[PDB]
Amino acid sequence: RPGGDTIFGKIIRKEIPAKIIFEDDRCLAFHDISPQAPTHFLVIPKKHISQISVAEDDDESLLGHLMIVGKKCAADLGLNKGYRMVVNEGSDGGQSVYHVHLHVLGGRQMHWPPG
Amino acid sequence: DTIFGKIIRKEIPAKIIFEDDRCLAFHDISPQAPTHFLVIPKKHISQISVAEDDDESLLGHLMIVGKKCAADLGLNKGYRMVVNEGSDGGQSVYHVHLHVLGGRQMHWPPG
Numbered sequence: 279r280p281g282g283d284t285i286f287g288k289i290i291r292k293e294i295p296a297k298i299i300f301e302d303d304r305c306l307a308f309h310d311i312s313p314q315a316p317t318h319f320l321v322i323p324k325k326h327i328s329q330i331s332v333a334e335d336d337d338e339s340l341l342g343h344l345m346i347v348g349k350k351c352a353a354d355l356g357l358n359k360g361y362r363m364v365v366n367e368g369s370d371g372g373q374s375v376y377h378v379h380l381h382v383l384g385g386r387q388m389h390w391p392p393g
Numbered sequence: 394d395t396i397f398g399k400i401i402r403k404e405i406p407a408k409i410i411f412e413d414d415r416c417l418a419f420h421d422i423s424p425q426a427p428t429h430f431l432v433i434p435k436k437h438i439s440q441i442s443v444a445e446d447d448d449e450s451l452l453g454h455l456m457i458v459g460k461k462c463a464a465d466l467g468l469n470k471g472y473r474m475v476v477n478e479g480s481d482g483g484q485s486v487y488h489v490h491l492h493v494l495g496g497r498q499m500h501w502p503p504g
């Protein structure tokens with residue numbers, strides 16, 4: 279099944295409901311169900327890539343597209359004071375869903391270090 | 394101009410990890426993890442919010458360079474990539490830069 283069978287693949291195929299902000303042929307943005315900030319959403323590719331460490335060189339445009347969609351969605355959600363984008367890889371990153379995705383967090387002051 | 398422009402122009406020293414014709418990776422001067430480096434484009438994009446659609450391949454290139462550098466630096470148990478935007482994101486230099494942090498457990502929330 280296209281997109282795979284992680285929760286995000288199910289969300290891509292509208293088999294699991296999500297609060298979808300934006301959708302095009304390459305990606306989907308939707309709100310996180312355990313938000314770590316007042317606004318916290320995810321941008322995921324529709325192509326299944328399990329994690330950033332295995333992305334191919336020709337995935338560059340798709341990965342960049344996630345960030346462009348992320349900043350567009352942040353603007354449309356009114357995050358005029360800024361936001362933080364996060365990609366988690368593997369165990370030390372805390373990755374819990376092995377479908378590559380971009381977190382976008384805002385609506386409060388983000389602190390340093392970023393975890 | 395910013396201090397990262399000076400680094401690109403080789404006017405001040407940096408611990409450079411990787412360079413090609415469109416980006417540069419170097420260790421952060423104020424590291425927050427055992428491994429903490431930055432990937433920056435040579436094109437001066439001040440912040441991710443002003444990036445254009447024509448920049449998408451370049452931004453993806455930063456991430457691919459980032460993950461290749463992380464593998465080269467031995468980050469085989471994972472890592473976290475971070476881009477900050479604006480005041481609430483805590484952006485410190487107004488030149489787009491991707492943080493890559495690893496070598497310890499990264500926690501949640503991410504700041």
Ligand SMILES: O=C(CCc1c[nH]c2ccccc12)NS(=O)(=O)OC[C@H]1O[C@@H](n2cnc3c2ncn2ccnc32)[C@H](O)[C@@H]1O
Nearest residue numbers: 285295296309310311312366371372373374375499500501
């Ligand atoms: O999960 C982490 C760090 C967390 C974390 C937990 N403990 C830690 C310890 C250290 C570092 C990170 C962590 N790393 S992660 O990159 O894979 O993020 C996946 C994201 O996917 C979210 N999620 C899961 N099911 C859903 C969802 N969002 C929307 N839905 C709609 C329907 N169903 C969902 C989930 O809440 C999380 O924010």
